[model samples]
Target: VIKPDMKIKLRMEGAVNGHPFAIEGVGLGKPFEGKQSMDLKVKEGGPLPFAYDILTMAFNRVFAKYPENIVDYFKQSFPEGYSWERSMIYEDGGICIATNDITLDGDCYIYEIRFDGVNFPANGPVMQKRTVKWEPSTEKLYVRDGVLKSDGNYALSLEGGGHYRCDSKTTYKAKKVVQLPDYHDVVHHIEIKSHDRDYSNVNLHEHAEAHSG
Candidate 1:
């Protein structure tokens, strides 16, 4: 069933150098029964070095395939601690060139890619990432591979004695969360007679902005 004007998308999340990372985009192209032109917009965020280069390669590799395995490609291309969600596909060695708008948040680089002219396959597989719906909770929060996912408002307390809050429905990386000091470290006092140094005396509480939306 070759059809024109089909939509494709791709989303990936994981850690880069142990920092939270994510990339996502949507492609609107048609003539899936054969070759057709298409357009796409992509965004990437996290503590990434040479992020534009990395994302450019990723787009080229993942989007240009028949029934493109977005998640599998990322695991092979990137190091461990990374996962992907499928939303797009293509074939026939179609050319897809895209430009981007790169922004900075703290140390993370957020990128938006825009492009046109890509051929895709009809009946490509698409899978949405499963996320835990956010709810009010006083229990300790836990995340895997530095990834915290939610479909609604999410909040959590850190193991090192800190707090984090996300207002919207989305996923968050550890890099986006607060970095706690090594509060478990022992502090030695030089002058113990009058003035004493206590590990608890040091303030380690801090807050960070939401990572993804």
Candidate 2:
């Protein structure tokens, strides 16, 4: 059901806002198993004008000038139908979100991605990458991957060196409920460090404006 390195070419020739243009570009293709259904975005790359609109605004402006031939001038100056691609093969193929939390967790907020889950897209999880760690003495939760999750409970371990025990609910004396920048999609990973367990660090109090809402 997968065709690696496949793409769908689109040829567009028409008029947009009185501008005539022709463009041939390729979009990411998906794995379709007939009735099984698939999403082109699931395995492909490219922008839907949305990701590019913010980028091309300046060029569209004239600048929106021309003292006389306004309409025709716009058509000639910033002609439509051109396509945008990645600036570099190694760089990210997307743009930044309006706000950090919007993509991280929305208003719901997230915490951990957990372990023992299916390692789908990649061969491993961030746990192996050393992204999520807790300082035993200070109990500071340091997360480089905000929405990473776990299906188990987080409790203190009496058998280990003050480590966490995933299955014992009785060991957790008190839970300091905190939310991560939740939701999904790892377009850009951000680091979040807990300020002790109470979350009332003086610096955190001063940085209240950091919240989008």
Candidate 3:
């Protein structure tokens, strides 16, 4: 039984300028007893309030919250020494998640990472493509986001029902360590990984609406 300490909810709805665009984050696990976690700020322009802002967040810290006695659960599950298949949702392309593995590193849990993504054209649909990141890496609940820091990925996914498609280019997507539970029940279900830094890379000129999700 593993969980987060604080829960986070993020979104951008309604409409931007006269254009309509939306970005939502969901399906993430909650803190052991979880509390709402969120960070938001909006700005409006002048004659038409054509507005925007640059964003940078430790989204992993929000997505990967854990209980206070974080290591106890893993210890109870792996006291006999163990190994399991692992993955992080944020940057794996859903292709080679299992390729990366985590091993018991003494009292601390550890792993190595190698993946890639870009700033454009990757997938389809609502474009709510999530980087199920911010895996609860490390043993105890600490404020270290992206347990491991590696640089070597680019991503660009496209989707739209509006006048403009989401070029929501992340330009840079970082990979982080993912922590897991007793490898039996919730294994493979927890989309763990650190959240990527992103920005609304779009050109919304004439907006009637984009699809809602």
- Which candidate gets the maximum lDDT versus the true structure? 1
**True-structure lDDT of candidate 3:** 0.26
Q: On a 0 to 1 TM-score scale, where does candidate 2 land against the true structure? A: 0.16
lDDT of each: 0.26, 0.19, 0.26
Q: Give candidate 2's root-mean-square deviation (CA, Å).
A: 24.9
Error of 2 at 53 (Å): 6.7
- CA error at residue 178 for candidate 3, angstroms: 22
Query: Tens digit of lDDT per residue, candidate 3, span 1-213?
Result: 233332224343333213333443322324332222333332222121221211122122222323343332232333232232322233322221222222333332232322222222234221334322212212212223433221212232323322221112111122322353221111111122232234323211110111111
Pick out the ten consecutive residues of candidate 2 with the lowest summed lDDT.
Answer: 202-211
lDDT minimum window of 10 residues, candidate 3: 204-213
lDDT of 3 at 124: 24
